[PDB]
């Protein structure tokens, strides 16, 4: 998920701006629900996740808000020391403790139509539910959520945010939210504010918080840190805040999940867009969102590395010369502006294969035996920090490859990628243009169960929020535009007829058009 808030000084009109882009996948019915709420002293338009009694992306009369996944450290796994003579007992504070037992029944619809009945036993310790067993080592793994039992207090906190009228009330609501999210704030007075919300535990400083914590009782949480210690800022001096699930602040850690917060981070797409402009408007935010959605994210750090290597040898290798010309003219996007079904920049097909070849050569001979666990780290969708440090010759703890060995890899990957394109397409980069990846608003969301029948319509894959709001807090009222695909109404008639509002926003989404943000009842009636 990505977000941007622009303070008054960074905005052309002098009004604070807000941009939302929650990434919760693409399903039909959609993962978001858009609504307008209006009661005495409470007027708010926007969308929230399906089922939530509050808006998460939009604005009330006073403030605009959005959120992104925080990726903070709110989940710890505890390594329970089991009794060798009783697997349902673990050692805690000097004495054996009995696990809590619970038998659950599951009814399963058989393909034949009838239903079967399955029984399972789940176990609990003082730290939480047992998620895994290492019986061979007399170990059980339990899971502690910092937000255990406080999910309803988080709902209440989000509802108080809806009702809030100023930074003070919004921050109070932020301070009560117990789960790990980034909150973004913009108001009609020109203020913007950012909060890494959640209840983050005070951990033992005698453990490595990238690994499970021994459950014997000496390394227990000692409460939660004060909200003042949560990353946050009101009116940061840079004049704005951008985020794509990246690190909140230089020294804020998230233990086991650091892999999302490296030098190579996809937020660079939003940093580049904002830093390449002076004062900005909603039009600008939209062009930066377009860039992020279609960018080949490895290009930021790895296309310069590639070019630097090839330029050393392009005098004698005409193919390297042609590649460097094509790479340099490429705008780093995998886009389909003419809607011919093929990405416009043919050299993007080469870069894709070059990267894949390069990642394989960097780590296969060392991590291949563990690539079932590490490939998702070293080829992460948010960035390839370790790969970049190796190829760029920057310091690493283990000497993976020298800068000279790295260059040899970059070259070998180029030769192999180019040789495959010559054999299958030809020598002109125009012929390398790859067919666009498409997707559909399907039936199954991140909760991993079916909630409908989905949608047929194929649109180009976009690394983009599942909705977008562009809001400008003008002195009069919030203003702007948004899109909430596939459509408002997920109703299918018994006879198969889709509601007229089942997917009437998919064309807007795929063609980078939007509908007006409505706040004034006068405008709502004529919409």
């Amino acid at each position: 998920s990505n977000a941007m808030i622009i303070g008054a000084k960074k905005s052309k009109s002098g009004n604070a701006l807000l941009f939302s882009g929650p990434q919760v996948g693409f399903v039909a019915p959609g993962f978001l629900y858009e609504v307008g709420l209006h009661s005495p002293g409470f007027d708010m338009e926007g969308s929230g996740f399906i089922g939530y009694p509050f808006i998460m992306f939009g604005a009330n009369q006073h403030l605009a808000l959005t959120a992104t996944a925080g990726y903070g450290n709110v989940t710890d796994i505890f390594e329970e020391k089991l009794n060798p003579a009783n697997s349902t007992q673990y050692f805690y504070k000097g004495k054996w403790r009995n696990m809590e037992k619970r038998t659950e029944t599951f009814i399963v619809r058989g393909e034949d139509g009838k239903s079967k009945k399955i029984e399972e036993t789940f176990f609990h310790t003082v730290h939480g539910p047992v998620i895994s067993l290492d019986a061979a080592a007399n170990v059980a793994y339990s899971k502690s959520w910092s937000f255990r039992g406080t999910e309803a207090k988080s709902i209440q906190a989000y509802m108080k945010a809806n009702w809030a009228k100023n930074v003070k009330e919004f921050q109070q609501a932020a301070s009560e939210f117990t789960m790990s999210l980034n909150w973004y704030y913009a108001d009609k007075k020109g203020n913007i504010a950012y909060y890494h919300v959640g209840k983050y535990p005070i951990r033992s400083n005698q453990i490595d918080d990238r690994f499970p914590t021994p459950g014997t009782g000496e390394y227990e949480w000692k409460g939660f840190q004060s909200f003042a210690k949560n990353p946050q800022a009101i009116n940061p001096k840079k004049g704005y805040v951008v985020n794509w699930n990246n690190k909140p602040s230089k020294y804020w850690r998230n233990g086991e999940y650091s892999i999302v917060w490296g030098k190579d981070n996809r937020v660079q797409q939003f940093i580049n867009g904002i830093e390449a402009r002076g004062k900005v408007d909603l039009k600008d935010l939209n062009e930066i969102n377009y860039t992020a959605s279609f960018a080949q994210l490895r290009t930021h750090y790895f296309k310069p590395l590639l070019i630097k290597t090839l330029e050393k040898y392009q005098s004698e290798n005409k193919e390297y010369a042609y590649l460097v010309e094509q790479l340099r003219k490429w705008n780093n996007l995998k886009e389909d502006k003419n809607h011919d079904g093929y990405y416009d920049a043919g050299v993007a097909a080469f870069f894709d294969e070059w990267w894949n070849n390069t990642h394989d050569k960097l780590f296969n001979d060392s991590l291949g035996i563990v690539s079932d666990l590490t490939r998702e780290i070293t080829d992460h969708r948010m960035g390839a920090t370790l790969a970049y440090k190796v190829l760029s010759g920057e310091p690493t703890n283990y000497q993976w490859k020298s800068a000279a060995a790295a260059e040899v890899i970059i070259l070998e990957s180029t030769d192999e990628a180019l040789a495959k394109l010559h054999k299958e397409k030809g020598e002109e980069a125009d012929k390398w243009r790859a067919p666009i990846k498409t997707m559909t608003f399907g039936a199954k969301s991140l909760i991993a169960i079916p909630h409908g029948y989905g949608s047929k319509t194929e649109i180009i894959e976009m690394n983009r929020g599942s909705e977008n709001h562009y809001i400008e807090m003008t002195p009069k009222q919030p203003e702007g535009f948004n899109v909430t695909p596939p459509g408002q109404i997920g109703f299918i008639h018994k006879d198969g007829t889709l509601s007229e509002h089942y997917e009437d926003q998919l064309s807007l989404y795929a063609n980078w058009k939007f509908k007006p943000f409505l706040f004034d009842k006068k405008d709502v009636k004529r919409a």
Partner: protein, 196 residues
């Protein structure tokens, strides 16, 4: 359009988005649940089933292990009621109204199922059940917990253990620090330390 479900006016714009106009929050949040049910009743039903670990009753064995995971890590109704009882009385009451709103459309749709129950209900041969405030909290947990929950600590332990047994502890420790760092000081940040 501009309907009037109870003392709340509902204006649906050209995209079908409902705009609710109420005289107090109690009415507003009931209408909130009602319009969401009008538009997404089957989706609400299945999302609630996701949290309760009862999807297998509808879509079969393919979702048994997901149901088991949901119940393993989930809460009982009484546990969720205890959470609601810890909220401000107004907040609890509005969540109840939200559920009463959903229940209002449930009751309305079972009385005219051929026109108000979506096709999935007819094809899979079951009916939606009424709603309680606890179920509303369930709709929040099923989706929001996903973004907080992970077992990367266990993956990390397995990574270091398999590196250690092949390469030795000294080398594995260095490899793992490059894989899962303690703090990459050059990672882009949303705010600077001076902004705290």
């Amino acid at each position: 359009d501009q309907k009037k479900v109870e003392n709340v006016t509902i204006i649906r714009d050209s995209y079908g988005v409902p705009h609710l106009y109420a005289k107090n929050k109690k009415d507003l949040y009931k209408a909130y649940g009602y319009v969401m049910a009008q538009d997404r009743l089957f989706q609400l039903e299945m999302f609630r089933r996701g949290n309760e670990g009862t999807v297998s009753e509808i879509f079969g064995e393919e979702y048994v292990t997901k149901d088991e995971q949901s119940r393993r890590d989930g809460y009982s109704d009484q546990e969720i009621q205890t959470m609601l009882n810890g909220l401000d009385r107004e907040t609890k009451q509005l969540i109840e109204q939200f559920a009463e709103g959903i229940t209002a459309y449930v009751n309305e749709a079972v009385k005219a199922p051929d026109q108000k129950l979506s096709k999935e209900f007819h094809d899979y041969g079951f009916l939606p059940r009424k709603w309680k405030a606890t179920d509303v909290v369930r709709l929040y947990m099923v989706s929001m917990t996903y973004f907080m929950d992970n077992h990367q600590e266990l993956k990390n332990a397995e990574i270091l253990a398999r590196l250690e047994r092949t390469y030795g502890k000294e080398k594995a420790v260095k490899m793992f620090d490059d894989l899962v760092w303690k703090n990459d000081l050059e990672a882009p940040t949303s705010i600077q330390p001076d902004d705290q």
